[PDB]
Amino acid sequence: KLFETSPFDPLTIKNNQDVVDKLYATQSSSIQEVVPTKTFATELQFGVTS
């Protein structure tokens, strides 16, 4: 078997976004370069609304 758990099922995706979301869901099965944690933001602006 090439993978213990497949990265994603190709028959379920419909666009590029679906692949990205599926890859994030199955990333726990793979050996990760950096294990995700809470993100840290150094840049934030709020624009005026309607």
Binding site: V34, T39, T42, E43, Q45, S50
Partner: protein, 753 residues
């Protein structure tokens, strides 16, 4: 979030007569009442936001209409037919019904295919898909303009990272995006930083007190590691250690944070120790010239055994000479050494941040900035003070100075890290602007000496570093909200208020207008966030009052305000509201003429006694049509003579509505043209019942000539369009490529954890 719009708002209807001879295409953007006597642009702005809400362009959006297509059954078609817009099938049925009336042949197969293939979706070189559909002119212009304005903020992920690389520290782990997000990743960021100065400059006391308290509520929680001599041992205390620690950080974190010490009326060897410690282990920037004198005077009073009266008139140089001759060498304040930050500070694009190194220690040398410290301590040990043969004062002062020097030289790195972390929280403008206007953080002489004598190692564990990371996100959120609030308030002042004179009328007008603005602003959801209210209510005034005084100050400001995309969208709609009035149900002039006078009218739509004209006639029967303003017409008492000839009413905004009826009948108004009262005249509301015309109906022809005596004419609305000109309704919409992923959290680093 970035919303996605599936369908295009064509806003089109097709109206055809029962017999099919006449048909037209009408764009319905609604009816908007306009009040006369007040500025039209101000009303247009209110209607602009409601119009944008109707079209779904108020919030940032990206159009996806690429999948709204179908493919024909023919083999050689291989074309995508757009579903959005007015369907060509309706135009085909309308055109076929028209041909049936004239006994013409129906549309042949070749023309049917051409008409039904008018709406298509095709890709361009860049990968976007272009939709060509039938839609209104104003709906197309407004929608496409808002698309352009929002697209300026949509940038590639790699471009966004390049803008925020300089602000990323070294302690945090880099984030690995997926390979799709690197190639096809796009984000929506404003990427404009508004200045915080308008709030800070106007309220220096309130703003400084707010930020100093917030920082000190966190620095005081830092984890820490646990005879004349009898006099100074008794005064030793620790209960106020957390407060003095945070004051130490604040002095090294800001450019000019001045603190003061209030010595006792009768100086003690406690007082001289505190004066020496502050003049040695505190930045010269945090010491004022007055505090320099007062510290020097205390040294002279105790060491020279002189009372305050003689030294009260002495200058700085005289006091230094007097102290030096007695044997006291510590008479100078020392400038701290500035350490440059590793990364660019937040909200400071292309700027370098710096902070003072604590305890006046040179980073390159790792000892005190004064190179004669050991020599100076020796002089104090051997010197004779208080005009006494005994050396008890001299030796005990040298012992404490050595202890303070040793304590500072060992604990300086821990405080330097704390200052470095807390300096990164504040931007550059706050670093240069915040001042200690109110002396609310004065230090007692016993606290100053006990702090340096009993200095404790700062322990930077994981919990404290984790707590600061939470505060960094909170600080970043607060700055963004204040910048938006400042920008909103600066725009309100320019549009609403004006200059003030020395006349009672101007003052009364300003006061009443200001109260109306404040009441409207604070009604329902307040315009100003709770963060700005906290700053403006620090003194004790209520939220309404605090905002009111700030608005008065901002009048006449020259502050530059950045023009955000939603400003341009509303401005574009407001201009079209004034320019194209007939699209929205109002006009600037009307004409009242008797029936027997023949006026040239629009005849394209086949209306019976059409109330529309291409333009209101300049001359009728060789003479210019009389024009009367509405105010003059209202006061006229000879109106019966005037309406006999006919005139044009202008200098007012007239709201009108019309109902196109498919059948044939007399075109008449719902109500009478005018109402005549004792207190002036007026024009009743205008509602048209327009009917399509059959030229050979003798009954309806006689009724039009005889039953109605006066007729009202207005300029033909531009929303109306004859069916023969349906190709003028073809418009192009561009939707971005479907192979784009939008990243909601574009942060580039993770917490160390």
């Amino acid at each position: 979030e970035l919303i996605k719009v599936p369908t295009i708002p064509h806003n089109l209807v097709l109206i055809q007569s029962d017999n099919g001879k006449h048909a037209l295409i009408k764009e319905d953007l609604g009816q908007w009442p306009v009040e006369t006597g007040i500025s039209l642009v101000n009303q247009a702005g209110v209607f602009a936001v409601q119009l944008a809400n109707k079209l779904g362009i108020d919030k940032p959006f990206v159009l996806d209409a690429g999948s709204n297509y179908f493919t024909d059954t023919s083999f050689i078609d291989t074309r995508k037919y757009c579903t959005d817009g007015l369907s060509p099938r309706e135009i085909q049925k309308a055109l076929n019904r028209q041909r049936a009336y004239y006994d013409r042949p129906e549309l042949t197969i070749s023309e049917n295919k051409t008409l039904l293939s008018q709406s298509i979706i095709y890709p361009d070189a860049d990968g976007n898909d272009v939709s060509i559909i039938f839609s209104g002119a104003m709906s197309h212009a407004i929608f496409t303009y808002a698309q352009s304005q929002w697209n300026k903020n949509i940038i590639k992920l790699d471009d966004y990272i390049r803008e925020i690389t300089l602000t990323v520290p070294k302690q945090y782990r880099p984030r690995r995006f997926k390979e799709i997000e690197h190639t096809h990743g796009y984000v929506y960021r404003e990427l404009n930083q508004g200045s915080l100065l308008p709030l800070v400059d106007a309220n220096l006391k309130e703003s400084s007190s707010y930020y100093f308290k917030k920082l000190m509520s966190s620095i005081s929680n830092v984890p820490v590691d646990a005879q004349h001599v009898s006099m100074l041992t008794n005064r030793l205390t620790t209960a106020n250690a957390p407060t003095v620690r945070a004051i130490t950080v604040l002095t090294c974190m800001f450019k000019q944070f001045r603190i003061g010490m209030t010595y006792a009326l009768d100086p003690n060897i406690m007082d001289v120790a505190a004066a020496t410690c502050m003049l040695l282990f505190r930045p010269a920037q945090s010491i004022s010239d007055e505090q320099y004198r007062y510290c020097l005077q205390t040294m002279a009073v105790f060491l020279t055994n002189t009372t305050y009266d003689i030294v009260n008139n002495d200058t700085i140089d005289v006091l230094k000479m007097k102290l030096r001759n007695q044997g006291w060498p510590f008479v100078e304040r020392y400038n701290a050494v500035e350490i440059d930050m590793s990364v660019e500070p937040l909200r400071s694009p292309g700027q370098v941040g710096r902070y003072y190194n604590p305890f006046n220690i040179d980073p390159l040398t790792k000892k005190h900035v004064e190179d004669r410290l050991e020599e100076f301590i020796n002089q104090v040990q051997v010197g004779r003070f208080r005009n006494a043969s005994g050396n008890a004062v001299g030796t005990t002062l040298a012992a404490f100075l050595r202890a303070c020097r040793d304590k500072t030289s060992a604990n300086w790195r821990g405080y330097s890290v704390l200052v470095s972390r807390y300096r990164s929280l504040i931007p550059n403008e706050l670093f240069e602007s915040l001042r200690n206007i109110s002396g609310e953080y004065n230090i007692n002489p016993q606290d100053e000496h006990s702090f340096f004598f009993a200095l404790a190692q700062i322990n930077a564990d994981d919990e404290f570093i984790g707590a600061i990371d939470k505060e960094s996100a909170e600080y970043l959120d607060e700055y963004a909200t204040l910048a938006r609030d400042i920008s909103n308030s600066l725009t309100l002042v320019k549009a609403a208020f004006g200059p003030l004179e020395r006349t009672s009328g101007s003052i009364i007008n300003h006061a009443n207008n200001l109260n109306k603005v404040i009441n409207h602003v604070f009604a329902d959801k307040p315009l100003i966030s709770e963060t700005m209210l906290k700053i403006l209510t620090i003194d004790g005034t209520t939220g309404k009052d605090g905002y009111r005084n700030w608005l008065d100050k901002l009048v006449g400001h020259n502050y530059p305000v950045y023009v955000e995309p939603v400003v341009n969208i509303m401005n574009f709609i407001s201009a079209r509201f004034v320019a194209d009035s007939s699209y929205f149900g109002y006009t600037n002039e009307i004409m009242i003429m008797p029936n027997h006078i023949n006026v040239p009218v629009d005849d394209r739509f086949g209306f019976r006694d059409s109330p529309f004209c291409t333009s209101l006639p300049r001359t009728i029967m060789g003479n210019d049509v009389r024009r009367i303003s509405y105010n003059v017409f209202s006061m006229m008492e000879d109106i019966d003579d005037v309406i006999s000839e006919g005139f044009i009413l202008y200098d007012a905004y007239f709201n009108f509505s019309y109902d196109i009826m498919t059948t044939d009948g007399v075109t008449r108004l719902k109500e009478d043209i005018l109402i005549v009262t004792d207190t002036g005249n007026d024009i009743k509301p205008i509602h048209f019942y327009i009917y399509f015309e059959n030229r050979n109906d003798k009954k309806l022809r006689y009724e039009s000539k005889m039953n109605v005596s006066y007729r009202l004419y207005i300029k033909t609305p531009a929303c109306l369009l004859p069916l023969s000109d349906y190709m003028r309704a073809q418009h192009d919409y561009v939707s971005p490529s479907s192979s784009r992923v939008y990243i909601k959290d574009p942060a580039v680093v993770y917490t160390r954890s």
